[PDB]
Amino acid sequence: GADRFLEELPEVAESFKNFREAVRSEGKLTEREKLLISVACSVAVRCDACTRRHAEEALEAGITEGELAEAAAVAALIRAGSAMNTASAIFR
Amino acid sequence: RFLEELPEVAESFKNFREAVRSEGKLTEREKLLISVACSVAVRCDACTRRHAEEALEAGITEGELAEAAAVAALIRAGSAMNTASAIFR
Amino acid sequence: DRFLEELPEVAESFKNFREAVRSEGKLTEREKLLISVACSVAVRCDACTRRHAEEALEAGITEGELAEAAAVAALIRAGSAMNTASAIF
Amino acid sequence: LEELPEVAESFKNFREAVRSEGKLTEREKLLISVACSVAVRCDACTRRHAEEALEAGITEGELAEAAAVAALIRAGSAMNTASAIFR
Amino acid sequence: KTGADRFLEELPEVAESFKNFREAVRSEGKLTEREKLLISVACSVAVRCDACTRRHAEEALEAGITEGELAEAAAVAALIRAGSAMNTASAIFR
Amino acid sequence: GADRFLEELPEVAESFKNFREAVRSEGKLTEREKLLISVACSVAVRCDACTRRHAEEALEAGITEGELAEAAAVAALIRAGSAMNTASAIFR
Incomplete structure (x- = not known):
């Protein structure tokens, strides 16, 4: 539960x-921005349940799934970008 | 490098x-604001710093970044809450 | 396999x-069981949480006690996001 | 904030x-906070929560064992995911 | 997908x-295709993404890599998973 | 450390x-293969000390910088890819 x-x-x-x-x-922040951030962060943190919930609310408020995919893409980019930051430790 | x-x-x-x-x-303001939140949500200090200053030099205020940070913190706690339901049979 | x-x-x-x-x-067994569950939640592994939770329940620990342990993990995750939140300053 | x-x-x-x-007792919450801090790899949080625990009377060995549980769970969770390899 | x-x-x-x-x-x-495939699987495991793991495991199997070599790749992910924690743990000792 | x-x-x-x-x-698996995987996973999990340590051992065994940078790259990809997978919870 x-x-x-x-x-x-x-x-x-x-x-x-x-x-x-x-x-x-x-x-x-506008409600829209806070809703976009909620979805993007749920994707960054990789919580499937949270993502569904926040996305469903985002839809109920007028945000398209296209703008939602963009928020997700930002999360994907930061995910990769932070790994790269760690990657510089390969050098002496 | x-x-x-x-x-x-x-x-x-x-x-x-x-x-x-x-x-x-998405507008520039929403994308920059999202970059900061995700950076904070995934705990990458280098990422957070860079995106925060990118946002500050675009008009976004410290208080607005703190709210973005707040949401990320809410999601980190919320995500754990979801896992916590697994303590039940 | x-x-x-x-x-x-x-x-x-x-x-x-x-x-x-x-x-x-x-450490006592009770503490190690509570730590196991708390850690499973923090790391967000559902099957781990459920398994360690069953083991604790079998040892007499209550779901309320288990709930408080998971609550501590929820707090750590939100706190850690805030630690990185103050990396820009 | x-x-x-x-x-x-x-x-x-x-x-x-x-x-x-x-x-839960204070002692149990101190051990959990530290183990959880170790589990999510936040060094600042680990330091601060370990500081509080030491000032409360908990030893480093107790703190180390709490941390050993955290490492065990991290390794353990990856193996749960490794089952996908076997279709 | x-x-x-x-x-x-x-x-x-x-x-x-x-x-x-x-x-x-x-x-x-x-790197050789073999190395990149093993690495993809082990990383999928380290990051704990079930779909990614199944997906890269298949391409690795369809590439001729055994489940045995794959299980070892994961085993290393598990080791690094635990080792990284212990590194954070040193923050305990002052 | x-x-x-x-x-x-x-x-x-x-x-x-x-x-x-x-x-x-x-x-x-070969030693070279085991060393490459240690570096990549260290990056995927974002543990610098780990990356540094494992990379150094890899360099001593003959593996080059470029090969490690490639290893880390696969890690960046998977970190982003696992986010893309979560984003599928948006399309509801």
Whole structure:
């Protein structure tokens, strides 16, 4: 139970909701940008369940799957780009 | 440097990077903001630094990057929450 | 075949490595079981989490205790993302 | 996280809740925090959480064993994925 | 890949440039096809991507590499997985 | 920068060394092949010390910089490729 885990720890569960809510409602970014970031980060972190959920919300808000593929592509690029950064350690 | 060791792949990579960077479905502001979040989400300090300054020199404010960072942190915790449901039978 | 198949010696040694860490007496069994589950969550391996969770449950640990251990791992993942978040500064 | 008012506040509270949860002892949470820090390879977090654990009375050997569990799980999870090789 | 090629359908400009990147690194002359195949499998395992593993394992099998040599490739991924953790662990000792 | 760790737990340490030797001395793959895979995985997992260490041993055995840079390249590819796989959870 994705939330059954929450029932077990009442106090940490509600405090986690406040944190989620606050970051979800923060006004410095448009809802669209925050939704795009959520999907892109879910892909970067490689969490299939999270990606589906955030993507479905992104769709329900008007974001196309094409713009979603672009956010995913950015995550793919950073994934490769960071490996390259580590790659320079092959040199003495 | 590293790229230097391999001419062909380095060129292809450069092209792949410019392609996703020059994509027209998302504005410049959203792509830069996403680059910072992903960098933070995958914990690469070198990547985060470079993309953050690329975004700062494009008008994006520190506070806006902190919010982008916040989402990444939420996803790192959220993703673990999902795995945590596996403690049940 | 198996997770540990085709390679007899590497499989034998991995098991002994597992046994060594599992019977290391500087920590109690309960703590090692809780650490196992917490670590499985942090690394996001579902099958690992489920298996280590069953072993802990069989040893009397509660799913509430297991939930708190996974909660610590959730916090570590969000904290670590924030550590890299302050790499630009 | 001084930059975002409610987010920082709200995160701080989430942290305190996890840190104060009564189902596990302080000792057990100190070992977990360190082992988890090792498992996700965050050196800064490992340092800080190991510092706190040592100041609480936990020895380096105890901390090392916690870390050995983390390494075991990292190796173990990859082998779970290696089963895909065998179709 | 109905799911990965559906991505090709959404972003032809980037997916294509990526397929070219994949091919460049896939056809480099520095390493033999055998080495690149084993490396692809072991890395898929180290990064814990199930689909990637199955996929590269097949191309490795269809290339004549045995499951035995492949299991050893993974075994090294596992070793590096554990070794990297222990490196982070030294941060414990002050 | 990982030997201090082994020190505290003598048994676990020798136990890890045995495992390390069992994989290092596996006949199914050549030494050159084993050294290339160690460097690439070190990059894939993004552990610098590991990359540095394994690369150095690889250089001493005859493998060149360019061959290692290629190894790391496959790692960059797979790191990006595994993200592309997750992105498939978007098309719903």
